[PDB]
Structure 1
Amino acid sequence: MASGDVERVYTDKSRYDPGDPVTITAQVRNTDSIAWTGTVQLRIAHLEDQVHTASQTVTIGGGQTEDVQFTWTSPATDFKGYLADIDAGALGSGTTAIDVSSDFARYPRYGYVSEFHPDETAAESAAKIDELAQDYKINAWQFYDWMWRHETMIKRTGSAIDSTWIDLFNREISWQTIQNQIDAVHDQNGAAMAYAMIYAAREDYESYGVDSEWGIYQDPNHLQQLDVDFGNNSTYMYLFNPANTDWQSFIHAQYLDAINTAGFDGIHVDQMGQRNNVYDYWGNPLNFPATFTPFINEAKSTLTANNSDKDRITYNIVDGTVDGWAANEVSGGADVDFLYSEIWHLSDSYIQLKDYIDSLKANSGNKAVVLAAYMNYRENIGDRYEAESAALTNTATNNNHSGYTGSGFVDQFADPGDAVTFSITVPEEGYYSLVFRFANNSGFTATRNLYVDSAFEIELPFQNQPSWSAWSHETWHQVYLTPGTHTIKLAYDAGNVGAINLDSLTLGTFDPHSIRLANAMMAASGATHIELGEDSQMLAHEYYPNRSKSMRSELKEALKQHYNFITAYENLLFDPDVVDNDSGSQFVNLDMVSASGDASPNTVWHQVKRTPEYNIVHFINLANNDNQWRNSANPPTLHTNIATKVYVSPDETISGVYLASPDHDDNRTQSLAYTTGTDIHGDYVAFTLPSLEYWSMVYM
């Protein structure tokens, strides 16, 4: 009676230079009561070939987990993905990708850091960076809102760097915490990108060395500078002209200060997106999107000059779509290391998004593409607990304003001593996003004290709404919980203010079905997705700190598989010589399973691609779902034993048919029995796909 499982498999770096040693670690647990002794096998593949094998015998104590390590000298050829497979027999097996790349910008897998707390220890910094690297092969990190001011990024008193500073949303940021994270990025061979704006400065900028003449204005008479109003009569961003060389000088020196003082590898340059009828200080009207490429290219050569090992840069093409505002300009002319675009509502369907990605590749000579595409945005999804069915304390149920869910809500929630108290029951250990749906027409922000299992947690704000029947679910707070039952109590306490009605509490939950389909479509079209950060947090909103949704562990497990898959098969997905095969949907036939070539809803979408060495067919299962990438989705209709025919040239050479999927068998390639044939439609290759859930790739 011998038993156990392989819990985790990871490498010591997210990215290796050719010829670097790779340490591959299997975290193996003996679940038996007595110590196990046996052989642990390592098998490393590159696509369909087995390129290395290794063995060791190892003794693991009963109830213990032990790190089983192998070492491997990466082959000397650059830009190669590999799959490492550890097999411990009765104690299970596990895989991880190895990425050999001298330049991460060829295969960016971009995460984020948004938390810089003085109380973050260096263990905590390291652990969050290590988790993203080990689990999802993250090789670059966008540091969001690390800076003090948009124009004065590091806060100094004299020539001393202050220890902490307060950012635009009143968050305390530590310099040491930023540094420790940057260091930990660098121990993973990761690149640390420093968030910055192309053209923003904070209020009172004239006293920080920034001339108002450099600005951009809504009129010809410099009356009204373009700005972002944060709604408190002091906190503003003011905008400037990216073509102004005096502004370029000022802000490019900030970028350099950031590289040289903090150790950042480059700059993640952001912008607000489309602006019209923009003038400079003198009333000369600007072709605004044409000002970006010159700013970026000048920023790039200034970086390279400063430090050519830390000259990285990207620019956010906001509101991405084919021929979108600034899109052709940047992709076509800007010297960014990889392309980045935040997708809003002009590429809502899978096919529109595919076409946008294809266009970026075609303008750019196939630069890598990273998409910011905030999944399940605004949807109040998860387990719901209606407030009317909660335990009430000097509060009551009612239903005299519409917009509630269930049968009613709680009101008479306006006095110290009042409280609502939910009994939630959760399936597993981890983060839960407490999302409150509520009404407040008090004229101003109300507050309530949240308690969790009787202990105080935090004061929550509840913004004011136009009426008592306009509801909001913008009040959230994330908490970590053990499995089972827990007490979540909103309470009116002395020092809290306003009044509210409480519809419900939802445990904000990212939907795996939609997220696996989006990631599959993106990789299959040659793009990756910025979505993971911190300690397996996921972006819910464009303000990266927003924790209104949490991932459950099935989603974490599936993203681990997916990110490893797109690393191990990076050569069939992201190399510049990976191209759509001509023609369309008449190349591929699935017998008795409705199918499309164009991401038609409720179909198995097949997409044919080619390298000089390989023919690639992607199968993405949209059965039981629509053609929109963002919104939560149903579990796809599972398919089994699908008789497939792929039509080929007579020209084409074929000595095997190979199958890999992030949904099955730990990303391992499987060799499929096939036949060649000829019918009226042309020459074909015929095989059976054992199954199709979210995404499967065949190559030959």
Structure 2
Amino acid sequence: IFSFKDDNNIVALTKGKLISDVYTDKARYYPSDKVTVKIELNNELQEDFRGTIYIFYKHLESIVGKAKIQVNIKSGQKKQLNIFWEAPKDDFKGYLVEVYAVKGNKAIDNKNTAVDVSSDWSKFPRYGYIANFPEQSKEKSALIIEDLNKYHLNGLLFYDWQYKHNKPLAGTVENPDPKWKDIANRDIYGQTVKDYIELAHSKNIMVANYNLMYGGYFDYVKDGAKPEWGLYKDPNHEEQDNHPLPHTWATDRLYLFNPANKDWQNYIFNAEKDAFRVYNFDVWHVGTLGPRGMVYDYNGNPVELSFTYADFLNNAKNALGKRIVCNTVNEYGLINVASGADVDFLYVEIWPPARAHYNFLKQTVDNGYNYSDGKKATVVAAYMNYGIADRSAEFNKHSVRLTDAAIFAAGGDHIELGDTGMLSKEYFPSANLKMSESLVKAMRNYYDFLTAYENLLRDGLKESDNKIEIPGIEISNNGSARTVWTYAKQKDGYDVIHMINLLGIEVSNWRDDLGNYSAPPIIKDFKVKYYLENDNIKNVYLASPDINDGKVMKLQFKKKEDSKGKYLEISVPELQYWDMIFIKKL
């Protein structure tokens, strides 16, 4: 009766009319932790409810637990219901949690959440951000943290919280200044920073401190940095490299330093040590600005910037006793960081206008996997609808979903959600684009999916060369326009096939610069052919954040053979944006 085909499942009639929300107390759980599932009921059935709430805990295709609770709730009344569960003992596992409201012998509402059991964020990063630190009650800060925990975000990057790039702590360790100007002359309140950190930590969220690897203000000599540590655009120390900034900001430019200079390292590590002593950050998120052209140290020797990164980052980790993440802009330095630096995971920011094609969302994640020999996960910053980011306007709910399907299916994570809603540009506080209610609802599904299926998306997978066909439909393996983008991967116990619908896409630009993409065409009851070596295939499944909020469905299939060999012919009921087929092997 919890099956949606079943005549005793009228959920489509009454969806969201009893179950208002479902979420958990934390972002991440240690094995055997108590998990608290929180259910918010709001009876909008215009009728009193006297029934039962069913909860199923699922690991991929399997039921790993269930619970039921009788609940009455009168028309127009609200209630909360908490369900308590012990996280299973296996580390690094994702689960879907399915909640059903049942009256009589019939399911009348359903909503899902997810649970990530991971002892460390670094295998399955789900990075978000906080860009604003105004004076506000701890109570208001707690509400923002609760909002973000809905998406199971397990890391938060605090963007432009610090005082100076070469002196992040305002005041001193013995007496910290409670208020200061950031880079853009915004007011930052230290107590808001501290509150966010504590609230994050109570939900097992890692908190990351943004600063550049190599930046200092116009007046860096006053604070005790030397021109002799600098990075220069010429071999005669005339023009120190720099990042120009708008004239109302705290300094007219950030001057750049040589990361390989040992005096810069000692100086910046000491300044950060002070910041980490006052503000209980877990991570230093080390920013970079990407390739800088031909550059030189003070004495005119050329500097190969990317060759300096790993040494800097490993020394920084040792100096601070904290975790490190480095942003390799446009993959500049990614090979060097992936193979040599003890970073928690890889982080790649795309700046435009190269890397516009959908395939780069996949390929960036593939490069991170290959250059790390499969040891590091990859986070992508890929700012959606960037061409309209100076408009008072909305994120396009279609292109945002396709971009996330592209990154998530490839085994990546997309840094996009935060206190201001969603990122529209590299300056995180810029918030001219808002998420509509429909997009928010999509993101809840997509982030539940990213969590519950993490074991099939980015755990022990290799690329498969088994051929896929979708008879009658144009396909591509690389995100080409007017195709279903499809490719396969394999791991121990499972083969996974992804289908991403670009049939509505005329031009394969993931960014959707006018914010005007449309709903993909919907294909129902079609066939996929998967050319498989082995015969011991008992079951084939599908899950999609577009279909019943990520609930697994068993698919019909047949074993067949034609001129290209043996294959499974898989019956697929529906594709909207993104479907994940998964085949259970031995």
| Counterpart Cα distance in 2 of 1:32 and 1:375 | 37
Counterpart amino acid of residue 207 in structure 2? A
Instruction: Within 5 Å, give how 1:496-575 maps onto structure 2.
Output: 507-534=392-419, 537-575=421-459
Report the counterpart of residue 674 of structure 1 in structure 2. 557
The aligned amino acid for 1:14 is A
Q: Counterpart of 2:238 in structure 1: which amino acid? A: L
Query: Secondary structure of 1:292's match?
Result: helix
Matched, 1:161 2:41: no
Secondary structure of the residue aligned to 1:554 is helix
Report the AA paired with residue 355 of structure 1: Q
Residue matched to 1:648: 532
Verify: 1:374 aligned to 2:383, yes or no. yes
Residue matched to 1:262: 279
1:131-186 Cα offsets, whole Å, 9 max, x none, are: 1112x111100000000111111111683111100112110100000000111111
1: CA distance between counterparts of 2:418 and 2:364? 25
Q: Identify the match of residue 334 of structure 2 among 314, 322, 327.
A: 327
Q: Structure 2 CA distance, aligned partners of 1:223 and 1:285?
A: 14
Task: Choose from 338, 347, 357 the match for 1:349.
Answer: 357
Residue 33 of structure 1: how far off its partner (Å): 5.0
Partner of residue 265, structure 2: 248
C-alpha separation in 2, matches of 1:48 and 1:93: 18
SS in 1 for 2:386: coil
Distance in 1 (alpha carbons) for counterparts of 2:388 and 2:362: 24
Question: Using the alignment, how far apart are the partners of 1:80 and 1:327 within structure 2?
Answer: 28
Note the C-alpha offset of 1:607: 0.9
Pick aligned residue for 1:316 from 321, 327, 342: 327
* Structure 2 CA distance for partners of 1:284 and 1:99, relative to 1, 3 Å: same
Inter-partner Cα distance in structure 2 for 1:7 and 1:541: 32
| Secondary structure of the structure 2 residue equivalent to 1:658 | strand
> Per-residue CA shift, 1:77-105, capped at 9, x if unaligned?
10100011111125511110100000111
Residue number in structure 2 paired with 1:337: 344
Residues 368 and 377 in structure 2, CA contact (< 8 A), matched pair in contact too = no
Question: For each residue in 1:285-308, what CA deviation from the matched residue of structure 2 results, as whole angstroms up to 9, or x when unmatched?
Answer: 21222111110111122233xxxx
Counterpart amino acid of residue 198 in structure 1: M
**Counterpart in 2 of 1:72?**
85
Matched, 1:229 2:244: yes
Shift of 1:342: 0.5
CA displacement at 1:605 relative to structure 2? 1.3
State the match for 1:622 in structure 2: 502
CA deviation string 1:482-537 (max 9, x = no partner):
xxxxxxxxxxxxxxxxxxxxxxxx641100111101100111111110011005x1
Structure 2 runs not aligned, ≥5 long: 1-9
Which secondary structure does the structure 1 equivalent of 2:88 belong to? Answer: coil
2:195, 2:69 → 1: CA distance? 36
Partner SS, residue 156 of structure 1: coil
Question: Is the CA contact 2:176–2:278 (under 8 Å) kept in the aligned structure 1?
Answer: no
Distance (Å, rounded) in 2 between the aligned partners of 1:616 and 1:269:
34
Q: What pairs up with 1:160-309 in 2 under 5 angstroms?
A: 160-232=175-247, 234-304=251-321
Whether the 8 Å CA contact 2:325–2:343 is kept in 1: the answer is yes
Q: Contact conserved, 1:26 with 1:94, CA < 8 A, in 2? A: no
1:255 shift after superposition = 2.4
Offset from partner CA, 1:575-597 (integer Å, 9 cap, x none) = 1x1111026xxx12222222222
1:698 pairs, out of 576, 581, 586, with: 581
1:16, distance to aligned residue in structure 2 (A): 0.3
C-alpha separation in 1, matches of 2:582 and 2:574: 16
Please, what TM-score do these two structures have when normalized by structure 1?
Answer: 0.77
C-alpha contact (below 8 Å) 2:173/2:278 kept by paired residues: no
Report the Cα distance in structure 2 between the residues aligned to 1:71 and 1:159, rounded to whole angstroms: 43
Seen in structure 2, the aligned counterparts of structure 1 residues 185 and 246 have a Cα distance that, compared at 3 Å, is same
Specify the SS of the correspondent of 2:380: strand
Give the SS at the match of 1:592.
coil
Shift in Å at residue 354 of structure 1? Answer: 1.9
Which structure is larger by alpha-carbon Rg, 1 or 2? 1
Offset of residue 686 of structure 1: 1.6
Q: CA deviation at 1:698?
A: 0.5
The correspondence for 2:518, drawn from 622, 634, 640, is 634
Aligned partner of 2:370 among 362, 380, 394:
362
Aligned-residue sequence identity (percent) comes to 38
**How far is 1:46 from its partner?**
0.2
**Which amino acid is the alignment partner of residue 525 of structure 1?**
A
CA distance in 2, matches of 1:653, 1:302: 53
Structure 1 residues 379 and 32: alpha-carbon distance in aligned structure 2, compared to 1, 3 A threshold? closer
Contact 1:194–1:258 (CA under 8 A) maintained in structure 2: no
Matches within 5 A, 1:136-155: 136-155=151-170
User: Partners in 2 of 1:102 and 1:39 — Cα distance?
Assistant: 34
> Could you tell me how far 1:129 is from its partner in structure 2?
1.4
Residue 221 of structure 1 deviates from its aligned partner by 2.4
Corresponding letter in the other structure for 1:371: V
SS in 2 for 1:331: helix
**C-alpha contact 1:259 1:266 (8 A) present in aligned 2:** no
Distance 1:588 1:219, change over 3 A: closer
Q: 2:68 aligns with which of 36, 43, 55?
A: 55
Shift of 1:331: 1.8
- Aligned to 2:441, what secondary structure does the other structure show? helix
Tell me, in whole angstroms, the C-alpha distance in 2 between the residues paired with 1:644 and 1:582. Answer: 16
Number of the residue aligned with 1:662? 545
Aligned to 1:107: 124
CA distance 1:298–1:60, shift in 2 (3 Å):
same
* Unaligned stretches of 5+ residues in structure 1: 305-310, 381-473, 475-505
- What displacement does 1:355 show? 2.3
Instruction: Pick which of 169-178 and 59-68 moved more.
Output: 59-68
What's the offset of the Cα at 1:347? 2.0
One-letter amino acid of the structure 2 residue matched with residue 303 of structure 1: L
- Looking at structure 2, the residues matched to 507 and 260 of structure 1 have their Cα atoms a distance apart, in angstroms, of 40
More deviation in 224-233 or 240-249? 224-233
Give 1:94's aligned residue. 111
Larger strand proportion, structure 1 or 2? 1
Q: Tell whether the 8 Å contact from 1:168 to 1:235 is kept in structure 2 after alignment.
A: no
Contact 1:117-1:174 within 8 A present in 2 as well: yes
Distance 1:571 1:243, change over 3 A: same
Distance, in Å, in 2 between the alignment partners of 1:652 and 1:303 is 53
- SS of equivalent to 1:619: strand
- Residues 97, 564 of structure 1: 8 Å contact kept: yes
Instruction: Give a deviation string over 1:396-446, Cα, whole Å, max 9, x none.
Output: xxxxxxxxxxxxxxxxxxxxxxxxxxxxxxxxxxxxxxxxxxxxxxxxxxx
AA at the equivalent of 1:319: N
The reply on whether 1:133 has 2:149 as its aligned counterpart is yes
Task: Pick which of 136-145 and 23-32 moved more.
Answer: 23-32
Query: Over aligned residues, Cα RMSD in angstroms?
Result: 1.8
- Work out the CA distance in 1 between the residues paired with 2:189 and 2:347: 28
> TM-score, normalising length from structure 2?
0.92
Pairing 1:5–2:18 present: yes
Between the aligned partners of 2:173 and 2:470, the Cα distance in structure 1 is 70
Shift of 1:624: 1.2
Is the CA contact (8 Å cut-off) linking 2:22 and 2:112 kept in structure 1? yes
Aligned length: 558
Look up the match of 2:4: none
Contact 1:166–1:173 at 8 Å: present in 2 too? yes
SS at match of 2:313: helix
- What is the identity, as a one-letter code, of the residue corresponding to 2:72? T
Kept after mapping to 1: 8 A contact 2:172/2:274: no
